[PDB]
């Protein structure tokens, strides 16, 4: 089947390699080319490729895989400590939206993704449409001012600030990415949106392959979505009641 990374110039691989560093600000194991190449061989194994040390655009696909291009550690304007909201009530506002698709495809899917987190965790989410809110969600073109290289269609699709009392909590989706609703020839917004919002709620990734924000995240709509309740158990301590026989 056709894809873009098989028709783009060889330059893509060093770009995609350079990209890997920014996921943590720095990564010590992605620094030195000896280690770059050792850790890219480890990427192929983690994803399940039949050749560790393949040179094929399939390997670019695992490097550019739908996720953000930002420090996914406490950083991207944050002190060292796990972020969480200081309440169980949070608001949100769709400040902006896409022209290739009507408003619904945002407003109903951010809400639905927040509903995914907020049925399990007793988090209340209120929609603001005029006024101040906690989570300012916008769709933007990437000339508007964030660190790192700009981005259009291709690698990187949102950034998200973790729970903050002003400037934090908030996301900018990529309006130059082609998101779908009914058409299927885009990135599934609801899918992507979930971990974008998971950022806005202050969670991390999980080693459990039943987890949603497991890094081998994709573009198209899941068949077999599930949560690790094992991860969420320590989120339930932060917003939920203490109700053990020994601790209540
Ligand atoms: C008979 C004449 C009719 C003319 C109709 C023109 C269209 C009227 C309806 C649409 C207005 C469009 C406004 C516009 O595109 O703003 C462009 C930018 C806005 O920043 P931008 O990111 O585009 O939009 C941000 C807000 N967002 C994300 C929430 C949508 O903001 C700018 O780039 C700066 C805007 C500076 C305007 C200065 C004052 C202009 C006065 C014109 C008065 C003419 C009187 C005849
Ligand atoms: C007092 C007299 C009556 C007054 C009427 C009401 C006036 C209301 C003014 C509204 C100002 C709102 C502020 C603002 O940010 O407006 C932004 C708008 C809509 O934003 P939005 O709907 O978010 O789209 C954002 C821009 N986009 C597509 C690049 C992603 O951006 C636009 O809508 C862009 C407008 C582009 C117009 C370009 C020229 C079109 C030509 C029309 C004629 C064509 C003749 C062949
Ligand atoms: C010599 C003096 C005059 C010189 C005038 C020259 C041109 C001045 C233009 C200034 C603004 C240029 C910016 C521009 O073209 O905005 C375009 C807008 C919105 O673009 P937008 O949807 O933001 O993104 C466009 C994506 N694209 C190009 C791939 C389709 O596109 C439009 O909004 C067109 C969409 C259809 C509008 C329908 C208009 C029907 C007539 C309505 C009459 C209403 C009562 C007045
Ligand atoms: C830099 C400036 C360049 C020059 C600008 C020249 C004048 C431009 C006037 C505004 C053009 C408005 C175009 C317009 O969208 O007409 C149709 C709309 C909605 O049609 P719809 O298919 O929703 O939107 C099509 C356009 N799209 C894809 C670009 C969003 O119909 C509606 O949205 C319903 C509106 C009903 C209420 C109207 C109340 C205001 C009356 C006076 C408006 C005077 C406008 C100057
Ligand atoms: C009675 C016969 C009528 C004949 C045609 C008249 C054309 C007048 C404008 C009609 C515009 C239709 C309304 C509209 O806003 O269309 C915008 C389109 C593209 O919007 P876009 O969202 O790509 O459509 C995507 C649709 N989707 C999501 C389902 C894939 O398109 C654009 O954004 C650009 C549209 C450019 C229009 C240029 C009009 C210049 C007219 C001749 C002017 C001569 C001046 C001397
Ligand atoms: C002084 C400046 C002047 C500048 C221009 C001002 C005047 C502008 C006129 C603007 C009107 C444009 C309307 C237009 O583009 O309609 C397109 C339609 C399809 O619209 P459609 O895709 O349903 O709109 C979807 C929009 N969405 C996604 C937001 C829901 O297209 C159709 O559905 C076509 C249907 C044809 C049906 C059959 C008609 C038979 C006609 C036979 C006539 C006699 C033949 C001898
Ligand atoms: C006395 C005859 C006057 C005849 C011309 C009157 C002109 C009226 C201009 C109104 C300008 C509004 C500009 C703008 O949209 O401001 C938005 C604000 C708040 O927006 P926002 O907070 O989103 O509104 C939320 C509440 N909502 C949806 C239910 C409206 O909305 C507001 O805060 C409303 C602001 C109203 C201001 C009216 C100022 C009048 C000074 C008149 C001085 C004497 C003139 C001879
Ligand atoms: C004599 C009676 C007046 C008595 C005054 C008594 C004192 C009242 C003080 C009122 C204080 C509230 C002021 C105010 O903000 O009222 C807003 C309303 C509703 O605005 P709303 O739509 O809720 O918010 C809209 C957007 N916004 C905030 C950005 C401006 O504004 C509206 O409801 C007006 C809506 C006008 C839309 C008209 C568009 C169609 C015009 C014709 C178009 C023809 C096309 C062929
Ligand atoms: C007649 C000789 C020439 C004939 C050919 C004309 C060809 C015109 C070519 C148009 C080229 C642009 C096409 C286009 O799709 O533009 C869409 C834009 C959005 O671009 P987009 O990348 O979304 O945002 C760009 C932002 N910018 C301007 C800060 C870099 O939409 C805009 O940025 C919205 C425009 C908003 C301007 C603010 C209007 C304020 C009110 C002014 C009222 C003026 C009355 C005199
Ligand atoms: C009824 C009145 C309608 C007019 C109303 C007033 C509207 C005034 C708004 C002017 C908007 C200017 C915005 C602007 O400069 O943005 C840059 C755009 C497109 O940039 P773009 O191609 O996207 O590349 C820039 C962004 N990049 C590298 C990140 C991809 O554009 C450009 O790069 C090219 C700008 C070309 C201007 C050409 C003017 C030539 C005629 C001027 C008049 C001469 C006779 C007096
Ligand atoms: C003679 C007529 C007098 C007209 C006087 C109008 C006074 C209007 C006050 C507008 C105040 C806007 C204040 C403000 O900064 O709002 C912020 C938002 C978004 O801010 P921000 O997210 O930084 O936008 C980032 C995107 N960037 C940097 C790439 C452009 O962006 C905005 O909300 C967009 C504001 C666009 C408003 C354009 C005003 C002219 C529209 C046409 C009205 C025509 C009437 C016939
Ligand atoms: C009489 C009372 C008037 C009071 C009006 C109040 C206006 C408040 C506007 C707030 C607009 C908020 C959104 C805005 O910042 O858009 C910025 C855009 C592009 O952002 P960016 O591309 O990031 O450039 C940022 C830096 N800047 C502003 C120095 C160029 O910046 C640009 O694209 C520059 C836009 C330049 C103006 C184009 C419209 C001129 C209108 C011509 C009207 C002729 C009437 C006969
Ligand atoms: C007759 C001889 C003199 C006239 C010479 C005219 C030369 C015109 C150069 C016009 C600009 C060309 C570059 C251009 O298309 O920039 C595009 C952007 C955005 O297009 P748009 O689809 O929003 O881009 C969205 C993102 N995308 C690409 C991923 C789909 O658009 C923007 O960012 C906004 C651009 C504002 C342009 C203001 C000038 C419009 C033309 C005015 C001509 C008036 C002549 C009197
Ligand atoms: Ca992108
Ligand atoms: Ca905020
Ligand atoms: Zn993450
Ligand atoms: Zn930003």
From Swiss-Prot:
Residues 1-75 form a propeptide. A motif (Cysteine switch) lies at residues 66-73. It is found in: Secreted, Extracellular space, Extracellular matrix. The keyword Protease applies. Its EC number is 3.4.24.23. Ca(2+) 1 binds at residues 134, 166, 168, 170. Degrades casein, gelatins of types I, III, IV, and V, and fibronectin. Activates procollagenase. Belongs to the peptidase M10A family. The conserved cysteine present in the cysteine-switch motif binds the catalytic zinc ion, thus inhibiting the enzyme. The dissociation of the cysteine from the zinc ion upon the activation-peptide release activates the enzyme. This is Matrilysin. It comes from Homo sapiens.
